Amino acid sequence: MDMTLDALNFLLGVEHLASAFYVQAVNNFTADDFKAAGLAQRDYDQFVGVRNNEVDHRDTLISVIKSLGGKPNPPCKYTFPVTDVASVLKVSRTLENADKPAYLGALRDIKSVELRTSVQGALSGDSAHAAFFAYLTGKAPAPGPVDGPLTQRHIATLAQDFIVSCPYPAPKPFPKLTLSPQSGPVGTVVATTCAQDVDTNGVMCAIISGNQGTLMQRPGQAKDGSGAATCTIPPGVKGILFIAWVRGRDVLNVGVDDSSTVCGPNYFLLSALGDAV
């Protein structure tokens, strides 16, 4: 089955959300707001550039889908937890960090050499966006060598806090997995809690890394007696991690197969050379 149109319309959903955020944020914040938050004119300028780039990413997907005889998805209805400039930068970082696995997963389904070149070229742009927002928020712009994929439903899981409703059947999220803390080095013990009362029998932690793939462990129990399941960041991983609860070892490569996913994933910002110290 040629899944090209499916993949493109999924990416269009991703870019409708991102473009809506940046259009609204540029509308509501000025360079003076950025400067009051300690940023420079060129940071606001690049922020407008990100808006323009994401509008292009959305419009290009619309054009390509139409050229293939498809019907482009409309926007959904969104909500963004924006108050001050700092929150704008955090939301931006969150969106761009989820962009990359979305594009990487979708590229597995794009049949054409030429269309892969175009889509990869947009992934490259969103990776530059991610590096910019990392740097502005004190995170390493390039924390590791390899970014990895996630599935469409995994991406829906990352996006769900920003979606109020969709007017068409979009990819369904898994329940949200809350991580505490959501950043830190190898060896960090992460308390994990699920938004729904899922079956925890046989649950394992999947730590999804770009450089090592999926690494499995059986969860621990929180030392504070709260009953939360813990997952410990294992050695050898590099870059941004995604942590999920999965059914046993049913799946070796969770980034390309969500058939065992129970809760999550959510992102974890692994410490890296380049973080503010």
Is 84 annotated as a binding-site member?
no
Which listed residue (5, 128, 166, 222) binds a copy of itself by CB under 8 A? 128
Which listed residue (7, 8, 11, 18) binds Zn ion by CB under 5 A? 18
For residue 47, the tally of other CB atoms under 10 A from its CB is 25
The runs of H, that is alpha helices, within 29-84 are 31-36, 41-67
- Is residue 275 a contact point for a copy of itself (CB under 8 A)? yes
Backbone phi and psi for residue 139, each to the nearest 5 degrees, phi listed first = -105, 150
Is 6 annotated as a binding-site member?
no
Is 43 annotated as a binding-site member?
no
57: closest CA among 101, 91, 88, 99?
99
| Binding partner at 18 among a copy of itself, Zn ion, none, C-beta below 5 to 8 Å by kind | Zn ion
Query: In the bound complex, what is the minimum distance in angstroms from residue 18's beta carbon to Zn ion?
Result: 5
Give CA–CA dist 5/71, Å, rounded.
Answer: 9
Strands (E), 70-117: 77-78
For residue 240, the tally of other CB atoms under 10 A from its CB is 26
Residue span 66-85 as binding mask against a copy of itself, x where in contact by CB under 8 A, dash where not: --------------------
Backbone phi and psi for residue 209, each to the nearest 5 degrees, phi listed first = -110, 150
- Is residue 147 a contact point for Zn ion (CB under 5 A)? no
- Is residue 126 a contact point for Zn ion (CB under 5 A)? yes
Q: Which residues line the annotated binding site for Mg(2+)?
A: 54, 96, 99, 126
Q: Which residues line the annotated binding site?
A: 15, 54, 57, 96, 99, 126
- Contacting positions for Zn ion (CB under 5 A): 18, 54, 57, 96, 99, 126, 129
